[PDB]
């Protein structure tokens, strides 16, 4: 299938022509700079079949960004943990955390009890569960000097609806004045929407991509985004175009990738949004992945 | 050659599978959305050869951007007229313009060939006076609608300034391997008011093996008029930073959102596509100064042979 094939190409290319380099994580990567993939969303939803990718995690995180929630309770409600450490690293400093300094036994335990309290205590949730360092902010809430809030996402839905032909369907997630502070500054620096023959397309620019762990996930995020915008502007879906800067496979992943590349695909699933509510009122329950079949998951 | 080949393919592809659409200017284009071109800078410097491109215009614009000069007197010394319209318009509104009402000209200059004589006549003096009277230049040479602003001077809520260019040059020096070498021109809080929202929304540097690469995301591209110029800016920009950072050049990677040939350029493209290439030129930079202190004189393009210019 074309989606898997696209990604298999990228994997293959990086293995063949990539350059061996050190990285900030001291893991080492084999890497290529600049690369472009395409995905026809008319051929279904591009959730990889040669390795399980979790629609729940992807859809939950993305709706979490688009709702402009910065509070990890919503994520925990669905058992999405992705952003747990980021918030834990705040909990551990304060006049609340009364456990060991932040062995693998203890942390693992201590993560649990934290998670516990964010769910069960509402007001402890508001307390620590609200990290603010995310995409969800950059999209819906960007500040100018004079304290005005801009909302890139609303604006582009209105400009797509009433001036489709424009070439300024841009959403940036890169604030130059917020980088040096940033926990982990964005990998998805900005994206662009395009409209032709009633079809919407999206190109993303990812400055930095972990091919084994991140791409598959992100591909799914940006495919789902398109679909959402598309539906909200009453359009059909076109392509997602995925542009990379540093596309890298970590050295601890070569085998994991090798195993993957030796697997044959299944047909891709399809996606249903079962509602006519504004996509900012859309809940995870309103999304449906039909006949998703994948080979099981691979491990680091 | 590989550079012309790359540019040709783009045209070639757009012409074939691009889609008829209407645009903001009501000119109509044929457009593809999503494309990526590479240019190996070790092979030479990518001034197109199937059509003459003015290194002078390219380099003087770029040096002007990166130096943070807001004043077009500089541009005019090199016969760079890229920004002469905005400047005439302000002037001819001011009360110390004592020539004929040049009110909303252009449509009106094409229209009326007695006026066009007065128009060309007045532009010639404005231009001459910008060059000859520094006073007059200070007071009428000076804009704000610029890429250099965002590269060099991005201000936050509290009035701290962030100079991206200089920050990445440092970060390249101290942390080549970082995947965070980013310079952005897209300030969403300002997009709704400004004259011409940047087409070059952002770019990224990369270091491998003593070599600096650069990828440009261009959200919009006039394949015919702008791209040949744009290729050479970013190529020059790759050299300049590589030199400030004590590195050699690798590749220019060029990504596009809306790559379009405007409807009235098909004719021009067709002629160009029919021509054959010369070996590309090379770029020497003849100075050991900071790139912010470097002058157009210090640049040298060597062995540029190309077919004649075209226009539309
Ligand atoms: O959505 C994401 C987020 C992160 N990463 C990867 C890219 C890098 O491996 C790492 C971020 O590190 P820097 O590029 O910031 O060093 O995580 C992704 O691939 N996708
Ligand atoms: O460096 C540049 C500057 C402008 N343009 C072209 C692209 C568009 O045709 C037009 C900009 O108009 P919008 O893309 O904003 O509609 O100018 C370029 O190709 N390159």
Curated annotation (Swiss-Prot), chain B:
MF-aspect GO terms: thymidylate synthase activity
Gene3D superfamilies per UniProt: Thymidylate synthase/dCMP hydroxymethylase domain
Binding site for dUMP: 24, 179-180, 219-222, 230, 260-262
UniProt keyword annotation of Transferase present: yes
EC number from the UniProt entry: 2.1.1.45
Subunit structure: Homodimer.
Family that this chain belongs to: Belongs to the thymidylate synthase family. Bacterial-type ThyA subfamily.
Name of this chain's protein: Thymidylate synthase
Native source organism of the sequence: Staphylococcus aureus (strain Mu50 / ATCC 700699)
């Amino acid at each position: 299938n074309s989606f898997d094939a696209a990604y298999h190409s990228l994997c293959e290319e990086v293995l063949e022509i990539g350059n061996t380099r050190n990285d900030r994580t001291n893991t080492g990567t084999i890497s290529k700079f600049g690369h472009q993939l395409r995905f026809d969303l008319s051929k279904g939803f591009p959730l990889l079949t040669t390795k399980k990718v979790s629609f729940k995690l992807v859809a939950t995180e993305l709706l979490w960004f688009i709702k402009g929630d910065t509070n990890i309770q919503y994520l925990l409600k669905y058992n999405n943990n992705i952003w747990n450490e980021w918030a834990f690293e705040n909990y551990i400093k304060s006049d609340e955390y009364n456990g060991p300094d932040m062995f693998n036994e203890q942390y693992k335990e201590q993560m649990k009890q934290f998670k516990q309290r964010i769910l069960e205590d509402d007001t402890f949730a508001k307390q620590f569960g609200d990290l603010g360092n995310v995409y969800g902010k950059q999209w819906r809430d960007w500040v100018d000097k004079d304290g005005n809030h801009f909302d890139q996402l609303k604006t582009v839905i209105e400009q797509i609806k009433h001036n489709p032909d424009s070439r300024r369907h841009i959403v940036s997630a890169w604030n130059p004045t917020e980088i040096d502070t940033m926990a982990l500054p964005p990998c998805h620096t900005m994206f662009q929407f395009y409209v032709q023959d009633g079809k919407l397309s999206c190109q993303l620019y990812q400055r930095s991509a972990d091919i084994f762990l991140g791409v598959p996930f992100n591909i799914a995020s940006y495919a789902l985004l398109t679909h959402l915008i598309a539906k909200e502007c009453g359009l059909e879906v076109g392509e997602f175009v995925h542009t990379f800067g540093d596309a890298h496979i970590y050295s601890n992943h070569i085998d994991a990738i090798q195993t993957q590349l030796a697997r044959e695909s299944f047909n891709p699933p399809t996606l249903k949004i079962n509602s006519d509510k504004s996509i900012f009122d859309i809940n995870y329950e309103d999304l449906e992945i039909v006949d998703y079949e994948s080979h099981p998951a691979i491990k680091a």
